[PDB]
Symmetry: D2
Subunit: 201 residues, 4 copies
Amino acid sequence: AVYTLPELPYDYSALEPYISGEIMELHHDKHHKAYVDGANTALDKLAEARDKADFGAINKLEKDLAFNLAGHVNHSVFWKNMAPKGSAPERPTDELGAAIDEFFGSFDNMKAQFTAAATGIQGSGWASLVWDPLGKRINTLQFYDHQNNLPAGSIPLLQLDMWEHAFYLQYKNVKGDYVKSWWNVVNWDDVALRFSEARVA
Amino acid sequence: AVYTLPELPYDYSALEPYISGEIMELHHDKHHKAYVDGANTALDKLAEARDKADFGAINKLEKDLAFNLAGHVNHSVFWKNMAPKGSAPERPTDELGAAIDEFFGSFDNMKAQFTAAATGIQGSGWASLVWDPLGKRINTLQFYDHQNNLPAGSIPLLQLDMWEHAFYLQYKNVKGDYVKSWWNVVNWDDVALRFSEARVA
Amino acid sequence: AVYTLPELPYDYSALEPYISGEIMELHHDKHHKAYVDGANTALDKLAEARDKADFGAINKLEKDLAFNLAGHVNHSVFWKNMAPKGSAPERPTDELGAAIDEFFGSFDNMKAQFTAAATGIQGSGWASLVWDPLGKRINTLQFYDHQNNLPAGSIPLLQLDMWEHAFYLQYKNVKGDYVKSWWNVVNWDDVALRFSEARVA
Amino acid sequence: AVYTLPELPYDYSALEPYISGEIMELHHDKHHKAYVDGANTALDKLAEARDKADFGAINKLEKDLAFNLAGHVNHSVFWKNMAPKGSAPERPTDELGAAIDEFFGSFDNMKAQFTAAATGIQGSGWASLVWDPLGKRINTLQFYDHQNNLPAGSIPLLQLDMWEHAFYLQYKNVKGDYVKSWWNVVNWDDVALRFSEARVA
Ligand SMILES: [Fe+3]
Ligand SMILES: [Fe+3]
Ligand SMILES: [Fe+3]
Ligand SMILES: [Fe+3]
């Protein structure tokens, strides 16, 4: 198949007590898996349309592709963006840390803007730290669902899933507590990797 | 300023008779300029938000940034994607042509799928030929407005502005004629360049 | 058929010089007509799905229905909301005028809020004065496309089409001039009728 | 205040075993309350905007109003649409039942179409049985979030909250089981009342 479900780089319960193993298992095995199948199906349907020379359902297929592929992209990044508490540095450093200070003033200011974007979403969405290739800078974006509210070419560096399934079982309606706990499991080494590959554009 | 308006790589009337100089001038000098100014203002407001620790309008600012920056990105690609007819090849060749044949079966099939995506939009939008870095392939996407219906990391190769301001003065409601004419002014050299640089590899 | 294209209550050129006959004809005969067909088709497809017990394309059909039916609703209201310059009162009076003063302070304040909503849309949309049955009041809403950014149960009293096809041929990018000219052709007697039937909820 | 939180017509645990009291309490006391407060704040800000003639955040305020008011409207209908099993009929009858048979063929067909719309949503949303005043019929709509994918004038008769917070704690990702259970607690008397009052006639 064109798309495959990547395995978590850690145990389902490795992110506790910040994110429960219950959520991690349901989130990965159920949710992420669905996006993989949906993205594969969307492409299969588009190829079928081309062969039959009938693009009557093009609007449906393009949304199915964007929604599912974006869901696949976002979650793939999400898993690697995290790691067990004491496994990685608690703060960005080197070029990444410098870039954060340059475009946000400081690490704390970056977190403040990112958190505000994360808890204020009206509906399902994501908070994301991205590399803007045009302006050559790091910005924060607030995705709607998986595929809305973002410029083409945006390269994800750090993403936080704000869909209710990502936190409801543990934090219920208190989104602030979820975001607060999540910072404790962010793998800044992975974010640095994504920044290095993004900046080399 | 963070963002700046790029100059057109040709005269306003250089795309005639396929795209009028009347449209090109309004589209570039007025529309694109507004996106650049809006994107800069969004960043200024976000910086101000970080300074005072007041992210009350974070939802507004994130959409303002996504909408304007996406408009700036989309139009910047749009201008270079075109050139006066004759000054550029009529069909894709080499690696680009081979990739189009691989992911769409043929140039005509890609053209048909892209056209369908362009004319079927329910609202303002774009038809876009992008490089999918996760699936390592070329796909077509149907953007809504400027910043909706697309996965993060999507790299634009060829885009067509389907907002009514891009064709109404000349083609009125007949969007189908607009798309047909547009193919004649596509600069496949520019598309090939973008494809070669997609996900630095 | 379930839906039909209503005729304009006046000549195509009756709204000049505020809105050209060229626009009125294209807008009514081309655009509005498309929504009627699309809404009829959406329902036909849904009935076909029910008979076959296959709702695989339910997401597509529900969007097709909402988009097209909303387009039909919005335009139907739009036409009747207007009349040749000196044919109707230039200001709301009686219960309608009183209600406007009550929920906006004055007629001018209502226009200011309505205009701001009309010219600020990021993409296609509408500015609409509606009757909120729950709060029992008149509010202004900014529709996105035709079917987005509005609560269920909202009863349209006065609507302004801000899609580019509604003004580009005459006012180009200058949206402010279009809205300004449009106020001169608003049929307040029709708005009063819609208010009377809405308030009787 | 303009908007107020309505009390539930039954105890939080009255919908068990179909819908948990745990969900009902959080959903009502926390979620619905937030929409009421948000809708009131939106109106306050709009009034403030009119006072100072500063509509700079008009796009934000119009979305805040649409999102919150739609959430308030949707949930107000949602609560009354349900009642403990047994306390209300298991199937629609009289005029309502006849209308459902007319516009869907049968109660089972309406149920199947509604279910499909409920489980297939790409993001947060609602499945809604509404009265179409233009077509003079009963249709099903698939709302996105609270305020998207619906025509103006749509009158809610029966709605199902498909936001993850409405079922995750009990049904996890199995939205299909949530919908099946939900049918058991539908108060057809309330739906019949809403149908009788749809477009005062
Ligand atoms: Fe998720
Ligand atoms: Fe444009
Ligand atoms: Fe229109
Ligand atoms: Fe809810």
